[PDB]
């Protein structure tokens, strides 16, 4: 646990990262791996077939050029593209996500210098002075970044080309009327309440079943497509037991190929059936619509205005890009939304507290099944749970009912933050023997709960240092290697490829993953902020994470990741608020570290710090936050007038009419 | 402190109230007192000169008819006018203020029955069950009243005649431009951002000096007007030392009459001067304007929409009625607003905590000056402070910068609530020896502050019982007597009357006084809710207050009080929230009363109660509150269309143009 010991593990992790980088150098040279290493370039059409032409040499024939810049040159090259160019290459979302890593450096580097020039030499009022300076600097940098990101969002929103969401609102909870259809209600309402600028509307329909049937058809057509064209005739008719799939030659359904062709045909028959009972029924039509307006100004008005005396009916909000719309959740009743949120809130309480016990349950189950038909339960335990955490949290957000992928990712990121506040930091080691602490809290005569818990849950430094070195050093290095997407496309272009040209593209690497990546940055913001006034040891390792992550993610944003939506940095208020939470928690923990005994000339200052931080947060929520939630009417009018001058005769009707039909 | 003792004081206070009612019976018979007893009727024009003709008999000649209904008949007569008729007679504000007393009965009567059928007989899980039922009932009644008051407000706003505020917004923080005047900036902005419906605007000017000069002129013209026309020629040239006024024949300024005529003339000369340097200067013009629109729908849009990328500039809010506008605060810079609020927040901390010490200071001062030139310091101490509390709190709200009398009254009512939470209830007796408790808190090694304070600050029952009987029984009875307004007009129609007809009207009794009356109701809501699950003794006395206050205030609303503004019950969210606070405090105190020792099958329920209450509050803030803050666009459009059909050719321009000029 000494500097020496920690430094040994540091060197090991630096080497692990370097090994990853070396493999990356080799794999990125392979012409057949370029599809999954330069995906963004192909998605942009700037690069051609994989290796600028594809299928060439330069692979294992020359391995990787023996040097130092083989596994290092990609770093300065990632830092070469200007930010403006990356805004048009990747998007504003990705550029401001990168700005969070730069913010971490802009905040922690100066405060690391301060903590290393005060604490370690002079080793108390120094702690409180440091705390103050740290919070002042953090807030100053947060305000400057709130301003820059807001100005970037506004510049982006103004220079953006026509988007259907700029003219549309999602009206929800349209009150049911026994004499009129949802469509008629909507049309009439917006023709009398927004007469001057109402253009068109698109009622939301529950086409979830039809969509799932179409998705099932495609899945089944591609299930045994590998087997269908393996050798045709009668191939390996595998039987993945119908309960979980995968498997293969395990159940009893041999039949034929292409997932037993008749099955694909019966799914097609059900698709036809559903199509009939979804277009001609008027019961699939949900109490919601997508109302478009002739001007962006009018849509802004509608989005930021109450329409009726019942503020829970005719709820109008800025619509999301048609590609950001999560259609399954647009068919969930509004009343249900609130109940689902509550159910998922308590399910999360359970997931963030009583989760080690179910993990131990499955661990014990795995020991039993391990004996039956070398093992040592490696890779399971909680590692697998941490890989599934983002997905579990995402399905929880989908249950809650968010109708935009952007918002779902933002909700999952907020949940992951709370998970990390509890299970990585305050409350990880306090969770002794499952709910033993909770049993004592239930049988506690007085209110000793905070006492017991707080006292023994502040966590340690050297242990956290190893976490940064494993998850934030070698972890971000593994990201550059893109192992799983490579494997996926390898076992797809060799398996179920059968494409006429380039239709079977499993090269898609998804996006940055705000629901996972941001929680990581925020956990290191938390760690670095809480420990800063106490120990200056966490800061150096946290800073290496920020620098490495900046470069690895910049590379991945320029070369691999493709944005699945464009929210124009709408998530920044969330980011800001989580660093504000980190700050407040830091000051609260310092109050505890320096409150017992101490002095009466310490508490007045350690109580002013949280207040100042909350006041700054409120100032920032009133100065910069509105830019991310409401479109200013002057900006909307400016865009409208300029567009109507450049294009005097645009038929917005056609463009906005079919924009919000369910993709099915 | 026994039932007997408390009942003796009860009888005394019942008799005091009856004595007040008896004097009221006599005084309301006097034909010369009718001006200040039936003021509303004269303000409405329904009644003529004082005693339906004025100056008659029926005074002391027959005294008061010896009976029982002399001092009792006014009660059923006050309960005779229907609520709808009172909405058009007095206003919605006054009708919903009366509804708070009825709400108190609707909440406390059923819960008094429950507490008297459970606690007293069976005398613990009964306390927690009572608490639950009490909160459920209170919330149910709160929700039902939120609904009724909201529907009443919407019905009122729809049936209201054209009001200038229905088409106007107060734009604040108009960004300074070196090339354009505030007027030009405003006009251009709203002609490009709200082109379709912008009508006119009225820039706010700092005419505070001119207004104060005009007010000074009138004050001086009426100062020694009594003396001017006492006997004319050369009358008693009194000298109120110029530092506080009043006095008379005390300073050195003898001069002449009418406050030394030359002074009135020099104030008139300064009025002329100021008029020049306020109309022709463009530096008096504040960065704010009153923008009117052709439709109420457009003003609603503007009020509930962000106008520019800087959400702190071009701030648009629904304008208040020109009569509700507090013009002095419309000339206070927006930046200053925030600082002033903070300064007044800490001044209030001082007023609600360290206030007994300044009272003791002045008390000790009065002992010294008492000897100099029978005394016993009667009526001073804190009684005088409680009469000045509403005024102090009002001047604090005026400092904060609220530009509407309605909002100033609402702010002062909120402050008075906090004062009462602390100094009437939790923290009154804990304030031992000024700041002795605070000195110990400053030198407290651990966090023993909550412990010490809470333990010894829950207050007692019998003592509170006497408070209800004095302030809520005899207090509301004294209100019916209207002593001070009577005296004022008596010493004005006999003093500085000199009116050609009926111009010197000091019969104006003001309004209900939301800034004072509501805090009282809320203090009894608090007391009755906190004590209910513990003791059922406070409830009966609290219920008598509600009943008596309902009848006395209904009488005063129908006969005396005249509304100075019409907010259409916009204060109800505040009322609701203060009863919600009472509920939460009640549950917190019950947790303390029943948490030490007790059981582990009591805490889970006593922690669910506050959560349920906050959840209900949030539901009510999302369902009913928006009706009080934002005008629904459908309602605005309905009013607009109906009005444009009844009156096809209205020139809203003329009506809305001169509506917002400073009354000077």
């Amino acid at each position: 646990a000494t500097l020496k010991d920690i430094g040994v593990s540091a060197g090991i992790n630096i080497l692990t990262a370097f090994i990853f980088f070396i493999i990356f150098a080799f794999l990125r040279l392979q012409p057949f791996n370029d599809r999954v290493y330069f995906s963004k370039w192909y998605l942009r059409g700037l690069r051609s077939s994989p290796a600028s032409g594809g299928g060439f040499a330069g692979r294992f024939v020359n391995l990787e050029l023996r040097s130092y810049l083989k596994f290092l040159h990609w770093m300065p090259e990632a830092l070469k593209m200007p930010e403006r160019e990356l805004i048009d290459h990747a998007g504003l979302d990705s550029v401001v996500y990168l700005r969070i890593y730069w913010l971490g450096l802009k905040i922690f580097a100066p405060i690391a210098m301060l903590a290393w020039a005060v604490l370690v030499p002079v080793n108390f009022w120094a702690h409180i002075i440091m705390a103050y300076a740290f919070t002042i600097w953090t807030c100053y940098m947060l305000m400057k970044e709130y301003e820059t990101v807001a100005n970037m969002r506004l510049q982006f929103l103004a220079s953006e080309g026509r988007r259907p969401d700029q003219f549309t609102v999602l009206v929800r909870n349209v009150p049911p009327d026994p004499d009129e259809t949802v469509s008629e209600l909507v049309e009439h309402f917006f023709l009398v309440n927004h007469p001057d600028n109402y253009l068109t509307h698109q009622v939301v329909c529950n086409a979830n079943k039809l969509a799932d049937l179409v998705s099932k058809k495609t899945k089944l057509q591609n299930w045994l497509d590998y087997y269908q064209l393996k050798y045709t005739r009668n191939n390996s008719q595998i039987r993945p037991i119908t309960k979980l799939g995968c498997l293969g030659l395990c159940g009893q359904k041999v039949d034929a190929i292409e997932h037993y062709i008749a099955e694909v045909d019966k799914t097609s028959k059900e698709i036809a059936e559903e199509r009939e009972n979804v277009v001609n029924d008027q019961k699939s039509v949900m109490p919601a619509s997508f109302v478009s307006f002739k001007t962006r100004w009018a849509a802004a008005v509608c989005a930021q205005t109450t329409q009726t005396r019942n503020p829970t009916e005719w709820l109008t909000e800025w619509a999301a890009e048609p590609r950001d719309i999560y259609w399954p959740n647009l068919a969930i009743p509004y009343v249900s939304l609130t109940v689902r949120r509550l159910v998922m809130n308590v399910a999360f309480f359970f997931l963030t507290f009583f989760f080690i016990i179910p993990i131990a349950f499955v661990q014990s189950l795995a020991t039993i099944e391990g004996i039956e038909k070398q093992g040592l339960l490696a890779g399971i335990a909680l590692k697998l749970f941490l890989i599934f955490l983002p997905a579990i949290l995402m399905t929880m957000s989908k249950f809650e009912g968010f109708t935009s992928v952007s918002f779902l990712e933002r909700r999952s990121a907020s949940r992951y933050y709370i998970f990390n506040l509890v299970n990585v930091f305050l409350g990880s080691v306090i969770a002794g023997a499952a709910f033993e602490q909770l049993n004592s809290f239930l049988n506690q005569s007085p209110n000793q709960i905070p006492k017991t818990i707080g006292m023994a849950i502040p966590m340690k430094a050297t242990a956290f240092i190893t976490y940064i070195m494993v998850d934030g050093w070698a972890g971000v290095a593994g990201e550059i290697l893109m192992l799983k997407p490579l494997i996926i496309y390898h076992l797809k272009n060799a398996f179920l490829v059968k494409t006429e040209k380039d239709r079977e593209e499993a090269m898609n690497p998804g996006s940055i993953g705000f629901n996972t990546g941001e929680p990581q940055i925020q956990l290191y913001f938390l760690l670095g902020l809480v420990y800063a006034p106490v120990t200056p040891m966490l800061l150096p390792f946290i800073l290496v994470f920020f620098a490495l992550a900046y470069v690895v993610y910049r590379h991945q944003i320029i070369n691999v990741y493709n944005q699945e939506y464009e929210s124009a940095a709408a998530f920044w208020p969330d980011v800001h608020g989580r660093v504000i939470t980190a700050l407040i928690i830091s000051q609260l923990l310092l109050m505890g570290l320096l409150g017992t005994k101490h002095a009466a000339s310490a508490a007045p200052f350690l109580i002013a710090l949280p207040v100042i931080t909350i006041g700054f947060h409120r100032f920032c929520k009133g100065r910069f936050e509105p830019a991310f939630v409401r479109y200013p009417l002057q900006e909307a009018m400016m865009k409208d007038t300029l567009e109507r001058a450049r294009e005097p005769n645009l038929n917005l009707k056609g463009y906005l009419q079919d924009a919000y039909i369910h993709p099915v």
Side-chain angles (χ1 to χ4, degrees), chain A residues 316-538:
Chain A
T316 46
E317 28 124 312
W318 268 118
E321 211 172 351
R323 74 170 165 150
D324 193 32
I325 298 281
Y326 189 59
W327 302 93
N329 287 357
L330 225 356
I332 312 195
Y334 193 66
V335 214
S336 210
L337 278 220
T338 337
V339 203
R340 288 162 165 257
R341 256 125 232 231
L342 200 123
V343 168
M344 261 6 194
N345 281 322
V346 313
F348 180 64
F349 188 86
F350 271 23
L351 233 240
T352 195
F353 277 112
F354 317 90
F355 73 106
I356 28 241
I357 141 214
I359 259 77
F361 281 165
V362 312
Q363 272 338 98
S364 91
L365 250 314
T367 68
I368 304 160
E369 66 100 29
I371 309 155
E372 173 253 331
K373 244 253 116 272
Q374 204 64 63
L376 269 332
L377 268 345
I380 339 262
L382 274 159
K383 186 243 228 257
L384 236 21
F385 184 65
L386 283 151
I387 310 269
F388 296 152
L389 229 4
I392 292 161
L393 264 14
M394 191 60 153
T395 54
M396 288 192 6
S397 312
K398 288 158 167 7
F399 189 75
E400 290 174 78
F402 295 90
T403 82
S404 132
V405 183
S406 130
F407 290 155
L408 290 160
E409 290 216 330
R410 281 165 69 180
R411 185 60 156 126
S412 167
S414 308
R415 296 272 207 201
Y416 215 163
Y417 189 59
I418 312 291
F419 190 95
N420 292 341
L421 287 178
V422 182
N423 308 302
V424 186
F425 205 175
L426 349 134
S428 42
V429 278
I430 223 33
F435 33 75
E436 240 39 68
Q437 249 228 325
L438 274 331
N439 292 324
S440 105
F441 128 84
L442 259 5
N443 309 318
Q444 223 110 256
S445 358
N447 25 70
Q448 225 242 136
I449 330 121
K451 282 98 119 190
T452 334
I453 305 197
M455 273 158 202
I457 64 145
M459 262 301 283
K460 32 237 150 35
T462 130
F464 266 141
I465 284 164
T466 74
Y467 192 83
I468 339 272
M469 289 164 355
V470 172
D471 300 68
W473 290 13
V476 307
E479 184 243 18
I480 217 62
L481 247 178
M482 269 335 228
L483 251 4
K484 208 208 18 162
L486 245 80
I487 298 165
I488 287 161
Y489 204 11
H490 280 136
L491 239 245
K492 238 120 252 105
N493 93 109
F495 254 36
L496 21 127
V497 39
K498 303 106 212 22
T499 161
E500 25 124 335
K501 235 276 296 304
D502 242 14
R503 319 283 92 106
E504 191 265 309
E505 295 315 284
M507 55 156 224
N508 205 55
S511 53
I512 19 130
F514 183 77
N515 61 116
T516 317
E518 147 94 351
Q520 198 209 188
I521 323 173
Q522 286 302 144
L523 120 102
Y524 294 133
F525 256 109
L526 216 222
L527 265 29
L529 241 1
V530 163
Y531 280 91
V534 208
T535 113
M537 250 272 108
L538 247 326

Side-chain angles (χ1 to χ4, degrees), chain A residues 136-441:
Chain A
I136 289 317
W137 185 246
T138 306
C139 287
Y140 177 65
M141 288 278 102
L142 249 36
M143 194 213 357
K144 253 55 233 109
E145 207 84 295
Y146 222 163
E147 186 164 45
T148 54
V149 172
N151 292 335
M152 249 182 300
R153 142 159 198 119
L154 285 165
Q155 132 239 293
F156 188 77
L157 251 22
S159 67
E160 232 188 347
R162 251 169 28 234
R163 283 224 317 212
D165 44 282
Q166 281 152 8
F167 295 90
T168 59
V169 297
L170 205 212
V171 58
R172 282 190 131 261
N173 220 7
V174 171
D177 175 63
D179 344 291
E180 263 172 282
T181 72
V182 192
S183 349
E184 277 147 23
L185 255 359
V186 167
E187 176 130 37
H188 288 200
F189 186 84
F190 291 93
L191 228 5
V192 304
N193 284 86
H194 296 268
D196 22 58
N197 274 306
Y198 164 73
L199 187 65
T200 188
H201 75 283
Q202 242 309 122
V203 262
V204 177
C205 44
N206 180 39
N208 297 354
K209 229 261 244 154
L210 182 61
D212 290 338
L213 277 167
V214 168
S215 98
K216 228 250 288 166
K217 216 254 314 268
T218 54
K219 266 181 265 115
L220 295 200
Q221 123 229 132
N222 286 333
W223 232 108
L224 273 80
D225 213 336
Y226 163 55
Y227 299 87
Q228 171 68 66
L229 261 335
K230 228 165 36 112
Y231 204 27
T232 346
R233 337 138 300 116
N234 10 271
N235 266 124
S236 168
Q237 345 263 235
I238 53 146
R239 336 160 288 196
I241 345 194
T242 161
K243 33 112 225 14
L244 247 112
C246 201
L247 265 339
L249 238 4
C250 269
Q252 223 65 70
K253 352 117 91 207
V254 240
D255 218 90
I257 26 207
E258 240 234 11
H259 211 267
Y260 340 119
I261 171 93
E263 225 275 325
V264 128
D265 214 33
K266 88 125 222 357
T267 312
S268 300
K269 277 336 131 13
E270 243 310 297
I271 280 162
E273 193 55 55
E274 210 25 71
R275 226 131 193 138
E276 304 147 20
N277 332 311
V278 100
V279 175
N280 345 289
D281 65 330
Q282 262 290 328
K283 23 221 187 254
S284 61
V285 187
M286 303 306 299
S289 181
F290 276 105
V291 186
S292 334
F293 292 90
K294 309 167 174 115
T295 50
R296 298 169 234 259
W297 180 93
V301 165
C302 197
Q304 61 212 64
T305 240
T306 157
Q307 320 279 328
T308 171
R309 40 171 67 220
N310 198 341
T312 80
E313 265 161 17
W314 292 108
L315 312 127
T316 46
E317 28 124 312
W318 268 118
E321 211 172 351
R323 74 170 165 150
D324 193 32
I325 298 281
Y326 189 59
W327 302 93
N329 287 357
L330 225 356
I332 312 195
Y334 193 66
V335 214
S336 210
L337 278 220
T338 337
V339 203
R340 288 162 165 257
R341 256 125 232 231
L342 200 123
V343 168
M344 261 6 194
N345 281 322
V346 313
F348 180 64
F349 188 86
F350 271 23
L351 233 240
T352 195
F353 277 112
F354 317 90
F355 73 106
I356 28 241
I357 141 214
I359 259 77
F361 281 165
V362 312
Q363 272 338 98
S364 91
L365 250 314
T367 68
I368 304 160
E369 66 100 29
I371 309 155
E372 173 253 331
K373 244 253 116 272
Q374 204 64 63
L376 269 332
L377 268 345
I380 339 262
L382 274 159
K383 186 243 228 257
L384 236 21
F385 184 65
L386 283 151
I387 310 269
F388 296 152
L389 229 4
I392 292 161
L393 264 14
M394 191 60 153
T395 54
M396 288 192 6
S397 312
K398 288 158 167 7
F399 189 75
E400 290 174 78
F402 295 90
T403 82
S404 132
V405 183
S406 130
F407 290 155
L408 290 160
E409 290 216 330
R410 281 165 69 180
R411 185 60 156 126
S412 167
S414 308
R415 296 272 207 201
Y416 215 163
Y417 189 59
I418 312 291
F419 190 95
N420 292 341
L421 287 178
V422 182
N423 308 302
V424 186
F425 205 175
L426 349 134
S428 42
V429 278
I430 223 33
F435 33 75
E436 240 39 68
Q437 249 228 325
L438 274 331
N439 292 324
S440 105
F441 128 84

